[PDB]
């Protein structure tokens, strides 16, 4: 067995040490005992590997010297904290596979090395300790964006405007339920926290508060569903989306579009959903009048997606749905022949309204639909290749005996293939 023993430790320092030690022990695959007193901590581990033993020793030393009232001990703590942070930040580099994430990681490490405050340093360490475990590089983007935002806003010369922006942004991030919104808020906040331009700060603070207004209105509309008050709130959401397009900060309009789409998807056939589709059309028209391409294409995309969901619900059939940057795909399964005819009939009935490029593929008892806009003729012909390949892969896998859960997985692997063939 291996043992550690930690004298004169203050309770807040004690409430740190075990957390980090446990995470290392759970990384190394070893059992642990811990015991606590007023002023003392004792720990024992099954046959701990020397590399982890040295890292735990480094952390224990750092904890004592971070508590110590001596300025030279606190300086040595800043050094050991930044040293451990730098090793963890380096450990993330090979694991991560997106260059913007690698940029964010290197920036976080640099911001921490510039930071005067051990508590900032420790939360940056906490973010990196989450990132190293994290399964999704997009969650790593959220984590590192939050890390960067915390560090860059917490700086020793930071204006209260920057602190207010960070507080608004992080509160919005904590309140939100869709990761895409969290990204769009945090990214704008990070760009503000990196900058010194008071116009960028002002624009971002208004934009974050306009996102907050959108988030709050969606909470009100949702929780008060089945009412004239919710029906009134739909109009107000759409009108803030229109104001966002009139101002041109159209990333928040992307938020508002998605918020309306959630409401519409969550309450099929309702008067609310009936208001939402009509709103989404005016928002698309407003986005076309303002030339905001990806946003306008997103409005078209969401409209068509609602329509196939509505067709599916009216047919009462199984479907699967996934999304991408400039296209949508919906896969229908077990569709009865008269419903194959009727779905085809309705896809045209949608298409001749919305003006989209659209492709439909029929194989076995599966139909794959793909919709795309703004892309070139050649990109559309490659998308035509992809949807045909998606139908081939799905039906040949189902012919090979792929279960429902295996086809549900396969759409993720095909969505990745569709990025890999880019």
């Amino acid at each position: 067995t291996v043992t550690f023993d930690i004298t004169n430790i203050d309770w807040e320092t004690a409430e740190w040490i075990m957390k980090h030690v446990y995470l290392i022990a759970k990384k190394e695959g070893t059992d642990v005992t811990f015991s606590f007193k007023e002023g003392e901590l004792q720990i024992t581990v099954k046959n701990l590997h020397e590399e982890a033993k040295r890292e735990i020793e480094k952390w224990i030393r750092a904890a004592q010297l971070a508590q110590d009232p001596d300025a030279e001990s606190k300086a040595e703590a800043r050094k050991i904290l930044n040293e451990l942070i730098t090793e963890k930040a380096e450990e993330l580099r090979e694991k991560t596979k997106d260059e913007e994430v690698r940029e964010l990681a290197r920036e976080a490490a640099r911001l921490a090395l510039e930071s005067d405050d051990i508590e900032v340093q420790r939360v940056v360490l906490k973010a990196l300790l989450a990132a190293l475990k994290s399964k999704d590089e997009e969650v790593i983007r959220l984590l590192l964006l939050a890390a960067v935002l915390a560090a860059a806003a917490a700086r020793s010369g930071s204006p209260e405007e920057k602190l207010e922006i960070a507080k608004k942004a992080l509160e919005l991030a904590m309140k939100s339920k869709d990761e895409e919104v969290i990204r769009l808020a945090l990214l704008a906040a990070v760009l503000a926290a990196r900058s010194d331009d008071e116009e960028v700060l002002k624009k971002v603070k208004e934009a974050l508060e306009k996102m907050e207004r959108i988030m709050d209105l969606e909470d009100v509309a949702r929780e008060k569903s089945g009412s004239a008050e919710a029906s009134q709130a739909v109009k107000e959401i759409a009108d803030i989306a229109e104001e966002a397009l009139r101002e041109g900060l159209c990333e928040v309009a992307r938020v508002a579009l998605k918020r309306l789409f959630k409401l519409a998807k969550d309450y099929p056939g309702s008067d609310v959903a009936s208001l939402a589709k009509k709103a989404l059309e005016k928002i698309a028209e407003t986005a076309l009048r303002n030339g905001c391409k990806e946003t306008a294409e997103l409005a078209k995309l969401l409209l068509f997606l609602l329509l196939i969901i509505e067709v599916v619900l009216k047919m009462g059939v199984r479907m699967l749905t996934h999304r991408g940057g400039n296209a949508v795909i919906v896969v229908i399964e077990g569709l009865h022949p008269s419903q194959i005819v009727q779905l085809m009939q309705d896809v045209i009935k949608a298409a001749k309204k919305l003006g989209v490029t659209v492709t439909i593929t029929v194989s076995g008892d599966i139909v794959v639909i793909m919709v795309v806009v703004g892309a070139s003729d050649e990109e559309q012909e490659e998308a035509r290749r992809l949807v045909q390949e998606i139908a081939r892969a799905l039906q040949e896998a189902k012919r090979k005996g792929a279960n429902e859960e295996q086809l549900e997985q396969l759409l993720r692997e095909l969505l990745e293939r569709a990025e890999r063939e880019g």
Binding site: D117, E119, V120, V123, K126, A127, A130, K133, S134, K135, D136, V139, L142, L143, A146, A147, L149, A150, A153, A154, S158, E160, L163, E164, A166, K167, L170, E171, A173, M174
Partner: peptide, 26 residues
């Protein structure tokens, strides 16, 4: 300085809580 030191602690705590929120669904 005091109001900024409190706001910084609020940011840090909010960030810890957000790191937990981002982790706990995983």
């Amino acid at each position: 300085e005091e109001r900024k030191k409190e706001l910084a602690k609020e940011v840090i705590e909010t960030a810890k809580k957000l790191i937990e929120k981002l982790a706990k669904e995983e």
